[PDB]
Amino acid sequence: VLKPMDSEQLREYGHLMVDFIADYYKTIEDFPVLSQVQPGYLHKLLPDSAPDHPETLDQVLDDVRAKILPGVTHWQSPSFFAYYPSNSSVAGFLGEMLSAGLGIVGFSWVTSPAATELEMIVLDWVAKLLNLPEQFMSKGNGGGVIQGSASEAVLVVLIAARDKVLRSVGKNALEKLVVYSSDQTHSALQKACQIAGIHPENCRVLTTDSSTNYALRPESLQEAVSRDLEAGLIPFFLCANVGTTSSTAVDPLAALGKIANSNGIWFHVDAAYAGSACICPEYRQYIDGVETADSFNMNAHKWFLTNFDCSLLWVKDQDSLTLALSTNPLVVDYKDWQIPLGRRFRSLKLWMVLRLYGSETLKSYIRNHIKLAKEFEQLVSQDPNFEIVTPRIFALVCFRLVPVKCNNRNRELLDAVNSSGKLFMSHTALSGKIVLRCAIGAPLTEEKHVKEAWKIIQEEASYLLH
Amino acid sequence: VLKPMDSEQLREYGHLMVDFIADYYKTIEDFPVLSQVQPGYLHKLLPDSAPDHPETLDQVLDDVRAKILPGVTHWQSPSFFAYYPSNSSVAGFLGEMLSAGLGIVGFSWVTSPAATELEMIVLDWVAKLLNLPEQFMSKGNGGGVIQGSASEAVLVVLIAARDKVLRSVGKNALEKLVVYSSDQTHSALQKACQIAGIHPENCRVLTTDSSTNYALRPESLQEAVSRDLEAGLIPFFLCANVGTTSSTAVDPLAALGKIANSNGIWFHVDAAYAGSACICPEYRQYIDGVETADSFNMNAHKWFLTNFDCSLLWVKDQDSLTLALSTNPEFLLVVDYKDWQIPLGRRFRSLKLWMVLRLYGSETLKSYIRNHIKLAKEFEQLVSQDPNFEIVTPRIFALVCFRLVPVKDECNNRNRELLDAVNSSGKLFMSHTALSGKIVLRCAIGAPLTEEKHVKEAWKIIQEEASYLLH
Ligand SMILES: N[C@@H](Cc1ccccc1)C(=O)O
Ligand SMILES: N[C@@H](Cc1ccccc1)C(=O)O
């Protein structure tokens, strides 16, 4: 009989669960990547009440196989090419295991000093791998913190910026604060603006087009800022993207940051996905200008082999955060850097990734995925029925069927491909027209899977065309 | 050489890690409960750069033993009596394992239908164990959702209420919105008010005292609301506590909710810790009146054996949440939990709750709560038998509030010194609070490993330390 806690039961049952998960990974290719169940399928398979008496672990695992797994979209499949990767690694899995086993909640330094200091140290490590400027290192006025997601990271710095303005001019000025970003910016910014009370008409979504590969034009930011200043409004927050979700566009951080600095605009850089690549010198160029940023954000749980959740946020003045987020009327108390109070030992998995793989292995991994994406881009360019929509900079390839009413052949192709169960890809829209995406990021993906995916896409397009 | 992903390497290394964690649990009593290290000790022990080449798992585990574990405050020690428990169970540990192994992110139904539907189902399961009214079941207009923490949950419903008011009266009315709570309410409410733009002067922290056992007096809420209405302010949010962090005080939900309903005040019930106990019929009484609440929150990762993170939030109208938190301009089907929370992504957290519920059973969960409450009752008796101490507030659950009685020796308040000596002994860990301005020591029995032997030993150590301090 299983007890609430017992070291030996934990050992036995944990070995069983380890074997189960390993078997899952060993046969992951046997599942349809995108789940094919119907909405509501699960409530008929499970009781509508918890059991009075315990049920076996074998029964739970059988229910996982037969009831839960059919309803899973396999993010770790070697043929998962959708959205952006959400990496799971052996090192990160071991880190999550250890974090759950320790079971500590580190609000404040005392409730596990190691949980705070290891986080400080590994954020420093990653900042050094990224060649971030000195203002983002813990030894200065700034520092780093692990957030639950890039959405929370942007909310935190937006609140910090808002409050820096409001406690100098008064809360009645909320109606005048303006946020700036390009029309490629992730929806997390709009949601943070809503939560923070920014007025909708003061969310400046600046237009971009193909002439700049959907990168924000600095001159349009300057014009918008000057028109807002003339109108008595207070520009206060700017979000630049390094690797947008749609087409992996990259904004010019230098000129945008010069504008933001000159006008007292908090400068946030969202490199949630592509930031990982910037540990490679041939891609570090793409965050040039970050020295002007007040904050910088990269998702280690995307393309850095660190199991969700692990969003990394650096700021150049931690006081802005803690003055906004503290509730109180020498050492870091991380509750004052985040929305939640409690937090788990999330730095362990990042530390274990860094140690067990090495910067060299992480670089080679980034490069291998980019090489696979370049092979896919080559395959696309050789087929006259397809076209590359925007230049490929990292491991994301945007493409589409060449134009030849009411029906959208690109969506039909994507639906048929995803329904095959052999792979999973997602779509976006650029300048109003649909765009198919192939984002290579799963650790299991090999060139064989990319080749088979291209063959499947070709066969499906040919069948639909006839 | 270790690969980014490999089923057999994962199998071998995961077995090694399972043995490591089991060894930690078997010997957890050998460590000082409260960490005794100095701030900054760790950066001197570790390199200042990530390594160029991989390091062995044995060296990593040895560093965990020798460098990290001393810097750990052992929340799962059977002698951890501080703040409130943050339970770790075999079931919850297995659920965390499976969640990490599958590695899904279910921000939308499509990106793993089971991750959404199992959550709906298990929130329904717990709602039935709590005998929550039907308005909170997923089949109606309301529903349940797993949040990362009670702080996030209260922020979410405060946002929903604020936007519901503002899109009716206009955003310029933000300066008039009033939030109400007692002076025992967790700081999460204040932090949410700050994030949400509530003006500081419009946060009514209403005083409580021993006459009601620090429970909020409804008449004072009524007075505050009438005075605010007469002054042109818009009451819009009320937070009632079921189990305050200080003294496990319980607010009268029925009369407070009567007032809130009558005045259009969003009624939130924070039962973060004590909500668990309410699966027992002898404690369900303490959330009577929740039927008037617009939202209700219980932390499964506190006292319900569900490894962090797992905060359970129920609402009676999911549309409030989704209309406030959705980013779609035209969308008015299926549940997309991104629209119920702050983050976009979310992991498969319903797995650990499902497994706790299935592998233990409601009967075992009830007995577990009751065992912790009985241990707290024994500790209370032990304190009451020592004349140098006193019970400060009645014990309702597994938290005992006590203190050394001040004595005029030829005046002094030893309690902070006693707590510091006890915590520095390393044999146990407890925290303090303040009631009506005077310091109060706390003993919150909540760790799954805690037995009566540990409670007795903790009391004996406290007595010895107080005896040393008195002379
Ligand atoms: N932001 C990604 C989805 C995603 C969310 C969270 C983690 C990983 C991926 C997209 O819109 O394509
Ligand atoms: N309630 C505790 C914080 C806490 C967090 C998580 C678990 C238990 C307790 C406090 O007020 O300090």
UniProtKB/Swiss-Prot annotation, chain A:
Name of one Pfam family that matches: Pyridoxal_deC
Gene Ontology biological process terms, A to Z: L-phenylalanine catabolic process; response to wounding
Residues bound to L-phenylalanine: P85, H186, H301
Coiled-coil features, chain-numbered ranges: none
First-level EC class: lyase
Entry superkingdom: Eukaryota
One GO molecular-function entry: phenylacetaldehyde synthase activity
Modified residues (N6-(pyridoxal phosphate)lysine): K302
Its EC number(s): 4.1.1.109, 4.1.1.107
Keyword line: Decarboxylase, Lyase, Pyridoxal phosphate
Catalysis: reaction(s): L-phenylalanine + O2 + H2O + H(+) = 2-phenylacetaldehyde + H2O2 + NH4(+) + CO2; L-dopa + O2 + H2O + H(+) = 3,4-dihydroxyphenylacetaldehyde + H2O2 + NH4(+) + CO2
Induction data: Induced by wounding and methyl jasmonate in leaves.
Protein task: Bifunctional enzyme that catalyzes the decarboxylation of L-phenylalanine to 2-phenylethylamine, which is then oxidized to form 2-phenylacetaldehyde, a constituent of floral scent. 2-phenylacetaldehyde is a precursor of 2-phenylethanol, another constituent of floral scent. Catalyzes both the decarboxylation and deamination of L-dopa to 3,4-dihydroxylphenylacetaldehyde (DHPAA).
Cofactors (names): pyridoxal 5'-phosphate
UniProt-recorded name of the protein: Phenylacetaldehyde synthase
Entry similarity comment: Belongs to the group II decarboxylase family.
Tissue: Expressed in roots, rosette leaves, stems, cauline leaves and flowers.
Quaternary structure and interacting proteins, as annotated: Homodimer.
Organism: Arabidopsis thaliana
